[PDB]
């Protein structure tokens, strides 16, 4: 069973959020064959396990991707595919790493593998299913950090739907219509963020994105709806961010919040962090700590698992969600090498 | 034929822009019966004609409405329905006023009746159909002035489609918002110290986002005399970088006619005789008056019973008493200017 | 002593906050002469006292003004000057009303007169000096209500200094602007649908830029009952990142007293007897009523002749007739509540 | 006469705008000694000349600096001083370059040197004095481009003073006061620029800077004043930019415009451009074309001299106006070398 050919076959199985079963089965097979006792759980996660040691470590990735396949090709040193980077590659690298684990290490560690479902959706159903069922001492989240990167944190998230409906009236009267009231709210949110962001590094900025806007063709009534989202710095968790957005909203506007995720930023010096620092050096690289603008199951899991936790994976995260998503094979391989080393170093304490 | 019941039956026939034929039919029927030689023209306008005299008077209204039907009912002295005020009401008032003209006036005037199609749309197809097919000495536009009101002017108009196309920092939609916010701030600065007729009005009609990335906005400007379409277009294209593509359509010139005119004097007398106090008005929407001024270089006002603040609202209605006063005023004004000739 | 000429002489003495001594002197003099045992206290307040009765009534006004002297003149029935309305006028009206009290009332009431210092400043030093030195059963605050007007309430207040300090993309000044623009947008959203008394008012008082780079702003908020100082402070500090430093001072609680009270009833009678129609008012500024409510848990209103829209303007004046009606109303109200006791 | 010691002595003579005479005299001396016939003109420019050829080339720098000396020290390979980079170094490099010119080149070229006054002020008096007096075939503007850089353009400029005065009134009334009306104008300008800048590279963006804001302590009247400036892309020259700012200003606001400068962006392939491309290669570097966000006498002179023109100078322009302004000596020297080569290559056609 070869790392890159196993990944390729993973990439070839489409797995938009909610439709992960086929790939879970595949990942579970490969894990069965590698001695990781693979299976597919009640949430359709790809599950595995190796080792019998008392130190519980969870290697948790996600096996869903954003919708829309890209044809898979190995060409040059680059493997192309939806999920190459985000994040079938990272999770497959977890699988092979765990598969090549020392007897010494299978003595100190019990390593649980979770290919989580619906990480790309608001639910994170998969990570949430597993949260009350595992009690790790350490957790590694499979998201692309680059093979030399150790990511220490990810921003939180808030999804907002805003709505205005009112009686229709002539477009020449000075009173704003429903769409305009929504725009004006959004503009107020921009102003709020600009003030909130003064002097702040990107990890500490409130960021917003207008995702959708719809206006009903008006007849008796005007209806407009707006979907936006925020990426949340540590200083502004979701419940605080809701109080702010609510205070900036006039009473004419209906708000619905969802996809609440808390930010997470872990300390620079833990057993886990040293373990990866050492493994990247062994593998011949220069480790760099990273903080990421995105949101991951690290945010989802932090409230449940009060333990040292980082995110690691080969590949370049700026290829998330693009039509030419790919990883360098040599990077993917260094990725496996780093995961194994990190586990071994963990076991050597 | 009863004025109010005839209007009611007009309201009961949906005539959203482009689908005016059924109601034109009904209006033409009614005009036949009244001795107004009713018919439907090629542009599906309701047409009628009375009189033989040398001086041509056009009473031009419109018979399309914006969409959304209001259940038609008579209740508490008010007739409710889409078009009650804008502008089936005013046109029906024109029909009945014409129908009761003295034989004295029918020899001084020839009076043409046009229930125009597509006035609520960018085309104004209706009014543009008859523009070169009639040669008025005077013209009255049927839009709600209030029964004691005579409307001297309507703002011009410009419609705009803005488009932005990108690749998946801020996205196409957000960039269109920045444009919209700048044009708003521009309009506020241009408007400081101006009365409503002299203000620029800038409205977002629609905003469409398509998950490359692409977004469009449609805007609707109403234009004061100091800022006609080609001027407004120069500002807007100047504030748009080449990356935001603008399309212009629906251009109409503002119009504001003089306070003292034979038409104007006729209506003030007609109004006083009907027991009211006449009041000049400038309207902040746009009308077929704007479409027609460039073709008919003649005295022109807009008149009709009803309160224009109900235009396009879901409780559109006219007061019955006021509607009847509309009929009376029209007839007397028509009468007064037969006397001046 | 003539009321208007006495007021005039008061206006003619500058009393910007902190420099009230000369005019307190003059007011104390005048109160001596009137048999009101005039003096100047340690906080430089103008003080006076009349009556012997068990029920203490405080007529408290202020004698400082904002800076900028207006040439004092009597002209067209109007007395012009800094303080004419805010609030030398109301206090002088209180002096003369007290000076003409019946001997019947002088046995029911003891009436204290305070021309407070520094009411225009954050300190309100004056009113805070007397707060624990008097024990009123009722209190009247001398601020322009209009002669037919009785003021039930004034908004609270919060002052803010914002500072930003950097190294020479956007500069410190611009970043302070972003904060200001956000707090404005916050206030507009909080105010939608609220009457003025229930609105938050957010004013830029000063903006200082010093070419590291450093800039400061000073803001002045007026606060509705639903948003007192400590609440307003929680919003503002929440919307400020740590990089923008906020200082709070000048906090005053909003106050809005009940419509039906012996004080309130007294003034409505006094007003009717003076030939006017009494009207409750809520004022959008801040006053010593706000400073004093927390100390004097007793019925309280503000009253004085003059139109408060002239506060702080360069044409500040009171109409002479209205000023005299102020005297009359005050006296009658004082009289009416001696009768209820 | 040594390049770096001559520069050092230039840096030691303070020359804030308007007070350049002392340094002009010094620069003129050195030019006299080097055979460039130095003198100080009616505008206090440092003037020189070398060569008798029919091809007129002007090497024009500026000898004024922003106010505020920094103590001069040669330490490490770095020479510290107000003007090291902007722009006494560049002009001194012009002087020594011209001084070491071939006989072959003094035959084809007449090279005019101008150490212009008041370039850092709105006037640009010095460049404007010289504009009607020289008819170059080529012009090189002495501003720091880096020793490997050839700058092809600089943005234009507009200075704006805005004022509002009105009758004073109570701070609790909803009507905005004078300072607030000015802020609101500025905010409108921000919105205008944000829309103008959609999709635009920095050289093509309208940029603004609030320079000062004053509010009179109000007594009978409110007075507020605001000073800001714009850096102007090629698509928006100063007269167009005035129409825009004026349209966004309500009639209550008084505007005064000044320091109008037109943007300039020259073509990539001219005799001058090839001449510098070749000289940087000879000197062992990789030439890069640059467009700059700042404004220079290149903008001032372009309308007068319809000829190929670039900006060149050793040093890093991000040290303009900072308290530790300096140039690497070795860079300064490469700078001279490049200027000479460029002149020689010009003469060799
Ligand atoms: N009267 C309608 C339509 C104007 C366009 C004329 N074809 C309006 O104000 O929107
Ligand atoms: N009445 C003044 C001052 C209020 C502060 C009381 N010490 C104002 O509205 O600004």
Residue B203 to residue A171, Cβ atoms within 8 A: yes
**CA-based nearest residue to D142, from D301, D21, D288:** D301
**CA-based nearest residue to B93, from B214, B165, B5, B3:** B3
* Residue D131 DSSP symbol: G
C118 and C61 in contact (C-beta within 8 Å)? no
The Cα–Cα gap between B161 and B246 comes to 6
> Pseudo-torsion of CA B60, B66, B71, B73, nearest 10°?
-20
Q: What are the two backbone dihedrals, phi and then psi, of residue A25, each rounded to the nearest 5 degrees?
A: -50, -50
Q: Report residue B59 as tokens.
A: 């009473």
Q: Report residue A6 as tokens.
A: 């196993």
Q: For the domain made up of A155-261, give the CATH fold.
A: Alpha-Beta Plaits (3.30.70)
C287 in contact with ligand 2, CB cutoff 6 A: yes
Q: Which of D213, D219, D322 is facing C68, going by the closest CB pair?
A: D219
C44 in contact with ligand 2, CB cutoff 6 A: no
The Cα–Cα gap between A89 and A320 comes to 12
Collapsing DSSP to helix, strand or coil, B69 comes out as coil
- The DSSP annotation for D32-71 comes to HHTTS--EE-TT--EEEEE---SEEEEEEEE--B-S----
Determination approach: X-ray
Verify whether residue B119 is a known catalytic residue: yes
Is the sign of the CA dihedral A164, A166, A170, A172 positive or negative? Answer: negative
Give the A:C interface size as CB pairs under 8 Å: 66
The Cα–Cα gap between D293 and A201 comes to 24
* Nearest-atom index, ligand 1, CA of B290: 6
Resolution limit in angstroms?
Answer: 2.4
- The DSSP annotation for C182-210 comes to HHHHHHHHHHTT--GGGS-EEEEEEEEEE
Which numbered ligand comes closest to the C-alpha of B85? 1
Mutate to test the interface with A, among C186, C188, C241 (most CBs of A within 10 A): C241
Which residue ranges make up each domain of chain B?
1-154+253-341, 155-252
Angle of the D21-33 helix axis to the D3-11 helix axis, nearest 10 = 160
Q: Report residue A224 as tokens.
A: 């407009």
Residue keyed to tokens 């990421």: A292
D232 and D323 in contact (C-beta within 8 Å)? no
The Cα–Cα gap between B236 and A271 comes to 61
Q: Report residue C164 as tokens.
A: 């930003």
CA dist C256 → C223, C247, C281, C301, D319 (Å): 12, 27, 10, 9, 60
Q: A249 to chain C: which residues are within 8 Å by CB?
A: 189
- The DSSP annotation for D228-249 comes to EEEEE-TTS-HHHHHHHHHHTS
Please tell me the distance in Å from C188's CA to the nearest CA on chain A: 8
Give the A:B interface size as CB pairs under 8 Å: 72
Annotated active-site residue in C20, C41, C118, C119: C119
A95 and A10 in contact (C-beta within 8 Å)? no
Cis status, amide bond into D168, omega within 30 of 0 = no
Q: Which of B129, B222, B287, B304 most suits a substitution to test ligand 1, by most atoms within 8 Å of the C-beta? A: B287
Residue C189 to residue A244, Cβ atoms within 8 A: no
C323 and C87 in contact (C-beta within 8 Å)? no
DSSP H or E segment with residue B62: strand B55-62
B17 and B30 in contact (C-beta within 8 Å)? no
- Is there a binding annotation on residue D304? no
Strand ranges for chain C from DSSP E: 39-40, 46-51, 55-62, 73-75, 78-80, 109-116, 138-142, 149-154, 156-165, 201-210, 214-223, 245-252, 255-256, 279-283, 300-303, 317-319
Q: Report residue B76 as tokens.
A: 């508490």
Ligand 2 centre from C291 Cα, in Å?
10
Residue keyed to tokens 């209180």: C94
The Cα–Cα gap between C323 and D5 comes to 82
Cis status, amide bond into C87, omega within 30 of 0 = yes
Ligand 2 centre from D171 Cα, in Å?
10
Among chain C residues, the shortest Cα distance to A199 is held by C243
Q: D235 to chain B: which residues are within 8 Å by CB?
A: 241
- DSSP β-ladder status, C46-51 and C109-116: antiparallel
Q: What are the two backbone dihedrals, phi and then psi, of residue B53, each rounded to the nearest 5 degrees?
A: -70, 165
Q: Report residue C243 as tokens.
A: 């990089």
* Nearest-atom index, ligand 1, CA of B86: 1
The Cα–Cα gap between D279 and D49 comes to 22
CA dist A67 → A7, A89, A326 (Å): 18, 17, 16
Q: Report residue D184 as tokens.
A: 């609101």
* Residue A34 DSSP symbol: T
Ligand 2 centre from C207 Cα, in Å?
20
Q: Note the CATH number of domain C155-252.
A: 3.30.70.360
Q: Which of B184, B193, B235 is facing D251, going by the closest CB pair?
A: B193
Among chain A residues, the shortest Cα distance to C187 is held by A248
How many other C-beta atoms can be found within 10 angstroms of the C-beta atom of residue D173?
A: 18
Collapsing DSSP to helix, strand or coil, C237 comes out as helix
Q: Which CATH class is domain D1-154+262-349?
A: alpha beta
Q: Report residue B136 as tokens.
A: 């008025």
**CA-based nearest residue to B320, from B17, B23, B101, B89:** B89
- DSSP β-ladder status, B245-252 and B201-210: unpaired
Ligand 1, CB cutoff 6 Å, lining residues: A 172; B 119-121, 124, 157, 285-287, 291
The length of chain C in residues reads 341
Annotated active-site residue in D64, D148, D316, D328: D64
Q: Which of B175, B182, B192 is facing D192, going by the closest CB pair?
A: B182
Residues 6+ away with beta carbon under 8 Å from D196: B182, B239, B241, D205, D206, D236
Residue A195 to residue C179, Cβ atoms within 8 A: yes
Annotated active-site residue in D44, D119, D225, D344: D119
The Cα–Cα gap between D46 and D34 comes to 14
What are the residues of chain C with a beta carbon less than 8 Å away from any beta carbon of chain D?
66-68, 70, 155, 168, 171, 173-174, 177, 180-181, 196, 201, 203-209, 211, 220, 222, 284-286, 308-309, 311-314
Collapsing DSSP to helix, strand or coil, C102 comes out as coil
- Is there a binding annotation on residue B103? no
Give the CA diameter of chain B.
74
Collapsing DSSP to helix, strand or coil, C106 comes out as helix
CA dist A31 → A97, A100, A189, B318, D282 (Å): 11, 12, 47, 77, 61
Q: Report residue D188 as tokens.
A: 């409108």
Q: A231 to chain B: which residues are within 8 Å by CB?
A: none
Residues 6+ away with beta carbon under 8 Å from B307: B85, B144, B146, B318
Ligand 1 centre from A226 Cα, in Å?
28
Which numbered ligand comes closest to the C-alpha of B203? 1
Cis status, amide bond into D87, omega within 30 of 0 = yes
Q: Report residue B340 as tokens.
A: 């001046």
Residues 6+ away with beta carbon under 8 Å from B188: D188, D250
Angle of the A88-99 helix axis to the A21-33 helix axis, nearest 10 = 20
Strand ranges for chain A from DSSP E: 39-40, 46-50, 55-62, 73-75, 78-80, 109-116, 138-142, 146-154, 156-167, 207-215, 221-232, 254-261, 264-265, 288-292, 309-313, 326-328
What are the residues of chain D with a beta carbon less than 8 Å away from any beta carbon of chain B?
185, 187-188, 191-192, 194-200, 235, 240, 243-244, 247-252
Among chain D residues, the shortest Cα distance to C169 is held by D209
Angle of the B21-33 helix axis to the B3-11 helix axis, nearest 10 = 160
- Is there a binding annotation on residue C143? yes
Cis status, amide bond into D293, omega within 30 of 0 = no
Among chain D residues, the shortest Cα distance to C199 is held by D174
Three-state secondary structure string covering C291-330: HHCCCCCCCEEEECCCCHHHCCCCCCEEEHHHHHHHHHHH
- Is there a binding annotation on residue A321? yes
**CA-based nearest residue to B43, from B136, B138, B165, B125:** B125
Annotated active-site residue in C20, C41, C44, C64: C64
Residue D219 to residue C67, Cβ atoms within 8 A: yes
> Pseudo-torsion of CA D63, D68, D73, D74, nearest 10°?
-40
Residue keyed to tokens 């800077």: D209
Q: Report residue D49 as tokens.
A: 């000349």
The Cα–Cα gap between D141 and D119 comes to 11
D168 and D221 in contact (C-beta within 8 Å)? yes
- Can chain D be said to touch chain C, i.e. do they have 3 or more Cβ pairs within 8 angstroms? yes
How many other C-beta atoms can be found within 10 angstroms of the C-beta atom of residue B206?
A: 18
Give the B:D interface size as CB pairs under 8 Å: 66
The length of chain D in residues reads 349
Please tell me the distance in Å from C174's CA to the nearest CA on chain A: 10
Among chain D residues, the shortest Cα distance to B180 is held by D195
A328 and A77 in contact (C-beta within 8 Å)? yes
CA dist D61 → B169, D68, D91, D116 (Å): 38, 20, 5, 6
DSSP H or E segment with residue A201: none
Verify whether residue B328 is a known catalytic residue: no
How many other C-beta atoms can be found within 10 angstroms of the C-beta atom of residue C212?
A: 8
Residues 6+ away with beta carbon under 8 Å from C287: C119, C141, C143, C154, C302
Collapsing DSSP to helix, strand or coil, D261 comes out as strand
- Is there a binding annotation on residue C120? yes
The Cα–Cα gap between C68 and C120 comes to 13
CA angle C257, C258, C260 (to 5 degrees): 140
Homologous superfamily, domain B1-154+253-341? Zn peptidases (3.40.630.10)
């Amino acid at each position: 069973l070869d790392p890159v050919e196993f990944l390729k076959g993973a990439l070839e199985i489409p797995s938009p959020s909610g439709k992960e079963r086929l790939v879970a089965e595949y990942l579970a097979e490969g894990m069965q064959k590698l001695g990781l006792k693979g299976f597919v759980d009640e949430a359709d996660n790809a599950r595995g396990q190796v080792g019998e040691g008392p130190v519980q470590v969870v290697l948790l990735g996600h096996i869903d991707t954003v919708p829309g396949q890209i044809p898979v090709r190995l060409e040059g040193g680059r493997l192309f595919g939806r999920g190459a980077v985000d994040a079938k590659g990272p999770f497959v690298a977890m699988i092979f790493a765990a598969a090549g684990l020392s007897e010494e290490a299978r003595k100190r560690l019990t390593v649980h593998l979770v290919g989580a479902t619906e990480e790309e959706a608001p639910s994170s159903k998969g990570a949430r299913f597993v949260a009350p069922r595992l009690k790790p001492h350490y957790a590694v989240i499979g998201e692309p950090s680059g093979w030399e990167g150790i990511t220490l944190g990810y921003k939180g998230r808030l999804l907002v739907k805003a709505r205005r409906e009112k009686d229709h009236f002539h477009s020449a009267h000075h009173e704003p219509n429903a769409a305009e009231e929504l725009i004006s709210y959004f503009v107020a949110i921009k102003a709020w963020a600009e003030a909130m962001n003064v002097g702040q590094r990107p990890f500490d900025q409130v960021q917003y994105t207008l995702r959708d806007f719809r206006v009903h063709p008006a007849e008796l009534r005007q209806v407009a709806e707006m979907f936006f989202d925020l990426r949340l710095p540590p200083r502004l968790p979701p419940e605080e961010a809701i109080r702010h957005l609510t205070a900036y909203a006039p009473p004419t506007i209906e708000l619905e919040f969802f996809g609440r995720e808390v930010p997470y930023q872990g300390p620079k010096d833990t057993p886990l962090t040293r373990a990866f620092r050492q493994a990247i050096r062994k593998a011949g690289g220069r480790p760099v700590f990273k903080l990421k603008t995105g949101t991951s199951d690290m945010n989802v899991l932090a409230p449940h698992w009060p333990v040292p936790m980082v995110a690691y994976g080969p590949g370049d995260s700026t290829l998330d969600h693009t039509p030419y998503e790919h990883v360098e094979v040599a990077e993917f391989l260094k990725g496996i090498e780093v995961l194994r080393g990190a586990l071994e170093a963990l076991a050597q304490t």
